[PDB]
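In this supplementary section we document a worked example of the pipeline. Step one takes a protein sequence of length 132 as its only input; no multiple sequence alignment statistics are reported here. Step two produces a three-dimensional model, which step three serialises into structure tokens for compact storage. The input and output of this example are shown verbatim.
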Amino acid sequence: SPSYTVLGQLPDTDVYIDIDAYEEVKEIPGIKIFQINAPIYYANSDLYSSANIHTVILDFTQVNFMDSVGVKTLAGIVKEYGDVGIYVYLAGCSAQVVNDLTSNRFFENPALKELLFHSIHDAVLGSQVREA
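The serialised model returned by step three reads:
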């Protein structure tokens, strides 16, 4: 899909890249890592289309800002996975993106600040142990 890319881990490293870019790159069981490549309502439309995972990690490294519609869309993804016990983490948001999330009430509940990680690897380590 052009709107997201599934990422895997280069074995025994903290490097995460397109699963199809290199043969030995491998997804981590229990985690889905998607890099956002277009505004989130495109990826969200893909999500709806295909619809044992404990965590979904969204890599925001390509995202430069978010609009109000995008924030509402993301808040619904996080809510709906959370309602079945699956955490959605946001990896690599810039300070501007977090400002946009904040302005659009994504953190009305401050607990949602615990979904932010600087890197994909930090989010993978953060998924190991947490309130179930």
